[PDB]
Amino acid sequence: MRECISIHVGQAGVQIGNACWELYCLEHGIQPDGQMPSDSFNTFFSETGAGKHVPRAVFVDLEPTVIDEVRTGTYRQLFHPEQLITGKEDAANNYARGHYTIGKEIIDLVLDRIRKLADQCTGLQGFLVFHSFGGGTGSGFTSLLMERLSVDYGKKSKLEFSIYPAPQVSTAVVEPYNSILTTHTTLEHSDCAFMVDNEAIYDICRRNLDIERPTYTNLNRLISQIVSSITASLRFDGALNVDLTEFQTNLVPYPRIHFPLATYAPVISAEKAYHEQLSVAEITNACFEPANQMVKCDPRHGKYMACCLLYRGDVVPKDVNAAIATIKTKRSIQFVDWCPTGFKVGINYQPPTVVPGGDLAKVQRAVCMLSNTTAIAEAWARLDHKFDLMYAKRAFVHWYVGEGMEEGEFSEAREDMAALEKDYEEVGV
Ligand SMILES: Nc1nc2c(ncn2[C@@H]2O[C@H](COP(=O)(O)OP(=O)(O)OP(=O)(O)O)[C@@H](O)[C@H]2O)c(=O)[nH]1
Ligand SMILES: [Mg+2]
Numbered sequence: 001m002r003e004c005i006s007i008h009v010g011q012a013g014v015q016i017g018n019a020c021w022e023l024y025c026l027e028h029g030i031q032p033d034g035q036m037p038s039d040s041f042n043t044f045f046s047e048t049g050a051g052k053h054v055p056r057a058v059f060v061d062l063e064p065t066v067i068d069e070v071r072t073g074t075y076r077q078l079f080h081p082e083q084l085i086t087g088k089e090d091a092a093n094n095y096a097r098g099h100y101t102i103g104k105e106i107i108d109l110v111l112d113r114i115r116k117l118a119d120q121c122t123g124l125q126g127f128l129v130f131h132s133f134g135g136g137t138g139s140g141f142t143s144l145l146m147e148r149l150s151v152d153y154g155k156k157s158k159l160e161f162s163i164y165p166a167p168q169v170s171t172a173v174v175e176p177y178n179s180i181l182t183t184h185t186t187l188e189h190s191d192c193a194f195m196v197d198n199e200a201i202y203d204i205c206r207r208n209l210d211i212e213r214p215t216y217t218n219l220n221r222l223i224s225q226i227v228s229s230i231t232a233s234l235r236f237d238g239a240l241n242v243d244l245t246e247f248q249t250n251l252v253p254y255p256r257i258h259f260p261l262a263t264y265a266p267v268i269s270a271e272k273a274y275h276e277q278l279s280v281a282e283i284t285n286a287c288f289e290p291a292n293q294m295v296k297c298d299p300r301h302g303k304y305m306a307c308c309l310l311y312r313g314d315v316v317p318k319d320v321n322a323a324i325a326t327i328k329t330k331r332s333i334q335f336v337d338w339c340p341t342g343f344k345v346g347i348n349y350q351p352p353t354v355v356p357g358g359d360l361a362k363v364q365r366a367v368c369m370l371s372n373t374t375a376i377a378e379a380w381a382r383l384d385h386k387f388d389l390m391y392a393k394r395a396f397v398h399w400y401v402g403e404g405m406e407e408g409e410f411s412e413a414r415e416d417m418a419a420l421e422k423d424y425e426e427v428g429v
Helices: 010-028 065-071 095-101 103-118 136-152 175-189 198-207 216-235 244-251 280-288 317-328 374-391 397-401 407-427
Strands: 004-009 045-047 053-055 057-061 084-086 126-132 157-164 192-197 261-265 304-313 344-348 365-373
Touching: 004 010, 004 103, 004 136, 010 053, 010 057, 010 065, 010 126, 010 136, 010 157, 010 216, 057 065, 057 103, 057 136, 065 084, 084 103, 095 103, 095 136, 095 175, 095 397, 103 136, 126 136, 136 157, 136 175, 157 175, 157 198, 157 244, 175 374, 175 407, 192 198, 192 216, 192 244, 192 374, 198 216, 216 261, 216 304, 216 344, 216 365, 244 304, 261 280, 280 304, 280 317, 280 365, 304 317, 317 344, 365 374, 374 407, 397 407
Parallel strands: 004 057, 004 126, 057 084, 126 157, 157 192, 304 344
Antiparallel strands: 045 053, 261 365, 304 365
């Protein structure tokens, strides 16, 4: 058994962290008090003499209001007080403030509390980092944390769960700056990053769940399902993606191109009284629909470098192969010339767990497709354009420079993103 430490940074990371661990507890049969009347799950949960199952997680925010909801919440007994770290004042949507100014005053405390968790590990695999691109803390502090983690734990793999900003879901005007700034700094320290576009989850919640104006709870519960499908292989016995290393090996050919696209199916409204259960072929076909992707883009106009299929539920290997073989002769799936046109398949026999009273209906079978497509570069292009619009006038720059950051960092970060777009283009045809 090899352990995994989850790190939740800023409001987005913390709130999503809440949704994930709520789900993890439901899947493993762990009550909020920590007791488990019923190993692979020990990778995410430590055990006390009392039989309490404690999440191997760290919550960090530069202001206390978000984490305070955890300290007083349903799962207040689940986490050790040390795991919940809060500062006085936040980064004010300022990357520089979160990274340089405030980050310096709390980084040592965070690393020390993380060290506590690392000493409880017989063989730490690495870290799972949850954060937003837009927040001053989510962008600024995360990148600093990732840098220090690479120093203190060089040999440990680091995975990211990033929240891509969207105007439909409460963004600030400066969030394109923070997104580029954090991607640049974190790029060399992240082995594999799963971007989650708030616009895509917003639309999935409106389309499939019939929620006119989705809340953070609606969004996070949907995100948690995807995150759970990604980490299920680490928490259950699963011959595929058994360790953090396999994620890079199976999905990341080139170090810089470490942004796999996630696609989930099926998403059924719980209010839908009458619904027939979808077959293995039907949910597999839904993996190739842009509407079911976590990031808004067109894989039809890109090339695949890797593809992995993560099934959960009543899924027989026979039906999976029959579906894959059929899909290849009907769909337009273009792989890169230098890569094997194939699929890595993983099956978890326990069906997806859903939050009681949630918006998501219980299904017999579901699948999460992780595909490294050059089409995800569309998200970088959209983000880089917004950066260019503001940076051309040097709008809002004075705020970052005021925090100790140099003007050069902006251009340095943008040039790195420009190189990243070029890399995706070269890798196509
Ligand atoms: N999906 C999702 N996105 C969130 C959530 N909370 C915040 N966000 C997004 O995060 C971005 C703002 O960053 P925050 O995480 O709130 O800020 P922060 O990381 O706390 O940093 P500060 O600026 O110091 O408060 C916006 O684009 C929000 O849409 C959440 O619970 N779920
Ligand atoms: Mg905040």
